[PDB]
Short mmCIF file of N, CA and C in Angstrom, two decimals:
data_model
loop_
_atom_site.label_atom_id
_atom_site.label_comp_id
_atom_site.label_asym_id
_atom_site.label_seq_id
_atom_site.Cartn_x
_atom_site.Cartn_y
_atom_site.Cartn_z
N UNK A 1 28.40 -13.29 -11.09
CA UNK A 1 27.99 -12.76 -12.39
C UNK A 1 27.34 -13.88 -13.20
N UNK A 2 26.20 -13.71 -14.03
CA UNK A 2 25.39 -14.51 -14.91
C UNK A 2 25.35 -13.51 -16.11
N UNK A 3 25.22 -14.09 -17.59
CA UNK A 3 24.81 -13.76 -18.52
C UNK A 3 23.40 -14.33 -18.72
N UNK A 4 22.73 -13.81 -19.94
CA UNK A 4 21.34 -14.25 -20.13
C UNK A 4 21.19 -13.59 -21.23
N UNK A 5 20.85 -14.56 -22.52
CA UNK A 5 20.17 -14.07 -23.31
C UNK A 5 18.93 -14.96 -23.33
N UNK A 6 17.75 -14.34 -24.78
CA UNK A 6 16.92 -14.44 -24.69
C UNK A 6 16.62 -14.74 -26.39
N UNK A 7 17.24 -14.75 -26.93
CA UNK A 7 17.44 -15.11 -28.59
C UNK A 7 18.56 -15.51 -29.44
N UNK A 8 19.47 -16.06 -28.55
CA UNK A 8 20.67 -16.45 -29.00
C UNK A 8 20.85 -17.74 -29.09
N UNK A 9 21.14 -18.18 -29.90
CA UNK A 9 21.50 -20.04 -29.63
C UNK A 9 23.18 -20.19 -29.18
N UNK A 10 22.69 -21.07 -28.46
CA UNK A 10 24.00 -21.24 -27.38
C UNK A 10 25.74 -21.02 -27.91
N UNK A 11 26.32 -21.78 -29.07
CA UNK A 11 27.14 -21.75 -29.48
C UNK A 11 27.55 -20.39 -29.44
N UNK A 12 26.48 -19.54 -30.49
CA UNK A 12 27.59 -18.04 -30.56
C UNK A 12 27.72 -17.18 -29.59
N UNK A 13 26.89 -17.16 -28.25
CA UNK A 13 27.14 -16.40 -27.24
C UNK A 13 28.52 -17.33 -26.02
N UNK A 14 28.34 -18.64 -26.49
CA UNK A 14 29.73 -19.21 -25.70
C UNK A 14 30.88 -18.91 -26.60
N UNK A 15 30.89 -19.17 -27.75
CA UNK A 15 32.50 -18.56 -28.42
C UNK A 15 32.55 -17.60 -28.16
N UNK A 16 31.37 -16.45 -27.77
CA UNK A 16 31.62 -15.16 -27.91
C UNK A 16 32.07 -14.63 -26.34
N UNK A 17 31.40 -15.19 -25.38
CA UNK A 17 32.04 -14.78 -24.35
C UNK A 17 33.09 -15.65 -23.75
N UNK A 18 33.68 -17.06 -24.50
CA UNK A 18 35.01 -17.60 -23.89
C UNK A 18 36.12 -16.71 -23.54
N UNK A 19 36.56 -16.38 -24.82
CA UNK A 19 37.54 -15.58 -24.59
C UNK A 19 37.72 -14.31 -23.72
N UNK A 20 36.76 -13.26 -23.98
CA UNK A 20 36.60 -12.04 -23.20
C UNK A 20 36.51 -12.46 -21.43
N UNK A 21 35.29 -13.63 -20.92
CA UNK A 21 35.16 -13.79 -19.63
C UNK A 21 35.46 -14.83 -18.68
N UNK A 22 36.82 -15.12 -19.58
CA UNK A 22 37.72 -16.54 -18.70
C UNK A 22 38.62 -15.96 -17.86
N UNK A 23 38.80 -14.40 -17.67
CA UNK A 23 40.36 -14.53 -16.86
C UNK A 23 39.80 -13.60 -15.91
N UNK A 24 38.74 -13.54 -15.38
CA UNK A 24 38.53 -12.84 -14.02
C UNK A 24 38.95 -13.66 -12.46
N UNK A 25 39.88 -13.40 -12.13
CA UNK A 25 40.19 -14.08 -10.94
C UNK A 25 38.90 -14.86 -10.44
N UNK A 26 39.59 -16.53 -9.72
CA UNK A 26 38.88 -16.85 -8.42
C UNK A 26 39.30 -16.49 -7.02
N UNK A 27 37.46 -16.08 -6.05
CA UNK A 27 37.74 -15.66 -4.95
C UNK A 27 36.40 -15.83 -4.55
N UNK A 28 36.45 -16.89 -2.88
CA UNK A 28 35.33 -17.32 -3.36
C UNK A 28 34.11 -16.37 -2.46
N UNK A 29 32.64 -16.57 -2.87
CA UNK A 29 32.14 -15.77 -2.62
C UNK A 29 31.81 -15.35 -0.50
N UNK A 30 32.41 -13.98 -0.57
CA UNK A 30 31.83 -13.68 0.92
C UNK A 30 30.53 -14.16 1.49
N UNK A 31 30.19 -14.46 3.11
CA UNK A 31 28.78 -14.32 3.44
C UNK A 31 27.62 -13.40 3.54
N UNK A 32 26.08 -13.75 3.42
CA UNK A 32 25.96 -12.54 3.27
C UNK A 32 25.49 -11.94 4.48
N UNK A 33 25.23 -10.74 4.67
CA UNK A 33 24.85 -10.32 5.87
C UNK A 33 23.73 -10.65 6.49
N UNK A 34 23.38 -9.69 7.86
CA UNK A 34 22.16 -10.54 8.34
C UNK A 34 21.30 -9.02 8.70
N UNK A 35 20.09 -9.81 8.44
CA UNK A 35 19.03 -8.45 8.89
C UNK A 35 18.05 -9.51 10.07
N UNK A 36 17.54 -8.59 10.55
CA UNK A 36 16.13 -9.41 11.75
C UNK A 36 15.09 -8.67 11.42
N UNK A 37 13.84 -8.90 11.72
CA UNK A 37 12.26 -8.38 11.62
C UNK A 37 12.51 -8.15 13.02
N UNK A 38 12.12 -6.88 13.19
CA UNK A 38 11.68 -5.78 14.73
C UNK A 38 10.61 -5.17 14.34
N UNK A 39 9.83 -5.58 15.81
CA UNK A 39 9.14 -3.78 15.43
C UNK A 39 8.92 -2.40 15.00
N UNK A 40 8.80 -1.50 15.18
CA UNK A 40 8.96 -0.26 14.63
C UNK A 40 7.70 1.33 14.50
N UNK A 41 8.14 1.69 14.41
CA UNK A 41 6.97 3.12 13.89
C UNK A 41 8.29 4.18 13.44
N UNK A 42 7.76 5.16 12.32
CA UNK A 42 8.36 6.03 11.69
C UNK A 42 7.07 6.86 11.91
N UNK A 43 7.51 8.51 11.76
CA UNK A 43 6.37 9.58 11.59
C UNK A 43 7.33 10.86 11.23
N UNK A 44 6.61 11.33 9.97
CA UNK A 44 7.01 12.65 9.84
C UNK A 44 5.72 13.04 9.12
N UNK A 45 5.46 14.51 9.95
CA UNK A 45 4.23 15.06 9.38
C UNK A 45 4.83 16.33 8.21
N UNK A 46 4.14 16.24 7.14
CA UNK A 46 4.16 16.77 5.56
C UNK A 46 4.86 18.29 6.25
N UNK A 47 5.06 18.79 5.54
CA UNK A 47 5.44 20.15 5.20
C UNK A 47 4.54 21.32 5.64
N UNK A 48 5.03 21.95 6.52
CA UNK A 48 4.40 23.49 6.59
C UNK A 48 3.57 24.04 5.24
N UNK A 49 4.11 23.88 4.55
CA UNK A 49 4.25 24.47 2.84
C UNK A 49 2.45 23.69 2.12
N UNK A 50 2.47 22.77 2.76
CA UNK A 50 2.01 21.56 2.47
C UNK A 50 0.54 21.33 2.97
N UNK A 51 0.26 22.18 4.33
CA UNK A 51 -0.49 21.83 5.02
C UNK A 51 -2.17 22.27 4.75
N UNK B 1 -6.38 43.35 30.52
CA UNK B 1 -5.33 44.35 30.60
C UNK B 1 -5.24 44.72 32.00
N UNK B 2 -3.74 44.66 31.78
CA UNK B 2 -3.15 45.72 33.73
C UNK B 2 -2.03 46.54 33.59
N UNK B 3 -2.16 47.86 34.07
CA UNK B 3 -0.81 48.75 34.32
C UNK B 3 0.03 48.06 35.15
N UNK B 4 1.29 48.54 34.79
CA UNK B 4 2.20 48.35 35.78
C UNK B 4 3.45 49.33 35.64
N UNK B 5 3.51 49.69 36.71
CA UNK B 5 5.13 50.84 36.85
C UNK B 5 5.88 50.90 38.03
N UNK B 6 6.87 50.99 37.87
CA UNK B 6 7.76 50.94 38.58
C UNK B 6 8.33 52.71 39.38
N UNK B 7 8.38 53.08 38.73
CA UNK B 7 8.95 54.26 39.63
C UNK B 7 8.29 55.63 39.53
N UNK B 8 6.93 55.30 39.56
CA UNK B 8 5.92 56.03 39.25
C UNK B 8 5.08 56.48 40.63
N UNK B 9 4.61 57.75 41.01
CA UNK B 9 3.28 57.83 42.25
C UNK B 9 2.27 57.49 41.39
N UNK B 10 1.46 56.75 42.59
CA UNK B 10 -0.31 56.29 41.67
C UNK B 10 -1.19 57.57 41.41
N UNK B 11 -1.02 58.59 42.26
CA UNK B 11 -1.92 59.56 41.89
C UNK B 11 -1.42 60.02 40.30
N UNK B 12 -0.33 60.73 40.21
CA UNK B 12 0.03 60.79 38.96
C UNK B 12 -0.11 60.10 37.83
N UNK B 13 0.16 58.71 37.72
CA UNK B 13 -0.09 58.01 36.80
C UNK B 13 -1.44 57.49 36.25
N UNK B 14 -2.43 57.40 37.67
CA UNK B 14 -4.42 57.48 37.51
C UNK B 14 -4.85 58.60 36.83
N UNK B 15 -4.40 59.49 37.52
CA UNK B 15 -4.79 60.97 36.21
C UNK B 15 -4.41 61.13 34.97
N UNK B 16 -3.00 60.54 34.84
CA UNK B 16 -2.92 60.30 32.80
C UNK B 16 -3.42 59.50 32.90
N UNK B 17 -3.83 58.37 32.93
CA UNK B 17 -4.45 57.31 32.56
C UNK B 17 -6.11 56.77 32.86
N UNK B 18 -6.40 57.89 33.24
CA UNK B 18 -7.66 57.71 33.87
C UNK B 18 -8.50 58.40 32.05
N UNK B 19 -8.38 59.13 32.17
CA UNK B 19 -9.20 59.50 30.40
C UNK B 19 -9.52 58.60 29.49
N UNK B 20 -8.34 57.74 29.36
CA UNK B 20 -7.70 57.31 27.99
C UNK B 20 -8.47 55.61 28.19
N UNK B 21 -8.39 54.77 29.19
CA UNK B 21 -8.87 53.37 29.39
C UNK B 21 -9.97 53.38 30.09
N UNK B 22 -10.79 54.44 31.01
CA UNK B 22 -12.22 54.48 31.49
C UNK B 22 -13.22 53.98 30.43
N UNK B 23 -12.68 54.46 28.91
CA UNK B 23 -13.63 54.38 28.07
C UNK B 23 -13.92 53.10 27.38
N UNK B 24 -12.96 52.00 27.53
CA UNK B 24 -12.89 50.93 26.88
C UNK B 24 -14.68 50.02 27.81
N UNK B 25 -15.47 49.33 26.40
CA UNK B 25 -16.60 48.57 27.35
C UNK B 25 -15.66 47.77 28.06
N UNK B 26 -17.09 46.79 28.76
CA UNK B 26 -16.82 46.04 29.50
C UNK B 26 -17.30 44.60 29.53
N UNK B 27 -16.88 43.42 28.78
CA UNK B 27 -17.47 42.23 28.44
C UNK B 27 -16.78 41.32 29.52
N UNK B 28 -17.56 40.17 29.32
CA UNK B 28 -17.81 38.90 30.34
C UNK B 28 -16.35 37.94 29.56
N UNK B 29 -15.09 37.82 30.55
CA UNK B 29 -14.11 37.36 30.16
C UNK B 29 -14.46 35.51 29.24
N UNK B 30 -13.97 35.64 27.94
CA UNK B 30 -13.99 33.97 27.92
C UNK B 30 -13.47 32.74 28.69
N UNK B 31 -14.17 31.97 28.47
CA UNK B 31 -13.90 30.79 29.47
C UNK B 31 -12.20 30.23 28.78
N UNK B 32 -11.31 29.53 29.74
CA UNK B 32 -9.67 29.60 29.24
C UNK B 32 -10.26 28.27 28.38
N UNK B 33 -9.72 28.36 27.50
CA UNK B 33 -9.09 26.24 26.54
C UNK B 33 -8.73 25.44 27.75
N UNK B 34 -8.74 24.01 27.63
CA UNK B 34 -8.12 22.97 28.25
C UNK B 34 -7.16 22.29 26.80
N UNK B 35 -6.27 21.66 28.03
CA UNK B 35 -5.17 20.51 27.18
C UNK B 35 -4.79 19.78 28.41
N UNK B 36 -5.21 18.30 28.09
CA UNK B 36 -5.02 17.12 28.73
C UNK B 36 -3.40 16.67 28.53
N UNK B 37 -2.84 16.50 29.49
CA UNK B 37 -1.78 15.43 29.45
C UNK B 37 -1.75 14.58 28.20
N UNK B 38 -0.75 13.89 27.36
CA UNK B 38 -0.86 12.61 26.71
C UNK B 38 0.72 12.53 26.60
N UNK B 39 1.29 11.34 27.33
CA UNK B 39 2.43 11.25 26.64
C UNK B 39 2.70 10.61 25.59
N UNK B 40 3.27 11.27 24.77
CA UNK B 40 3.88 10.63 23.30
C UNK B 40 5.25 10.67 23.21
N UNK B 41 5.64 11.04 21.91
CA UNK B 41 7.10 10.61 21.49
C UNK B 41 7.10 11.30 19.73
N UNK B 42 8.24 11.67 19.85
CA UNK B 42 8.65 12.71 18.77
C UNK B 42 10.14 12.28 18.02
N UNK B 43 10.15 11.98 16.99
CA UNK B 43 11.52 11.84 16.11
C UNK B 43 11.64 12.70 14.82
N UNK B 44 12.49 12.93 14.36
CA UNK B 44 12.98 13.99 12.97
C UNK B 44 14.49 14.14 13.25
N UNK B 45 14.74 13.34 11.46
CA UNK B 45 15.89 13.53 11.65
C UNK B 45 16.91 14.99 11.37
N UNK B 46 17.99 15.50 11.34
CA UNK B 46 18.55 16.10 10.84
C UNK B 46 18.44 16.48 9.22
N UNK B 47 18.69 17.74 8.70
CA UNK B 47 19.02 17.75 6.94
C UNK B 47 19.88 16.62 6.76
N UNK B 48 20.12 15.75 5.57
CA UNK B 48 20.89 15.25 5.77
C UNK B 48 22.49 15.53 4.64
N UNK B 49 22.53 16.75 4.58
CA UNK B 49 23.33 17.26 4.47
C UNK B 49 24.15 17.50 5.26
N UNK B 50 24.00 17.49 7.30
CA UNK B 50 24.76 17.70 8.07
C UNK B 50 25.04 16.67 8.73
N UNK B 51 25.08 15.35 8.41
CA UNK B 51 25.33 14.10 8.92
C UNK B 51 26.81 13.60 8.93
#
């Protein structure tokens, strides 16, 4: 999780989120998965309705 | 067009039928279509409501 503002000066968005976003457990982050580049072809021809 | 019957004599069945199809003309049959071989490949999935 990240916050982000874009017009805030730093102080009042850190007092403001100390309190509320200090007590979310640590756990540390999982890996992430894996994809590969394959070949491929897809085809579906349009609709009867359509034609 | 061709008759065909099964448990019929031919004399009988030429005499009804002799009136009624003598009269049809007589044109020069069309030549049949061709379709070549091609192998391909076909996918579509299911609705996927029944998955």
């Amino acid at each position: 999780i990240v916050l982000a503002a874009s017009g805030v000066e730093h102080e009042e968005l850190l007092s403001i989120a100390e309190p509320l976003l200090s007590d979310l457990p640590n756990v540390p982050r999982p890996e992430e998965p894996k994809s590969v580049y394959t070949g491929g072809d897809y085809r579906c021809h349009t609709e009867s309705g359509h034609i």
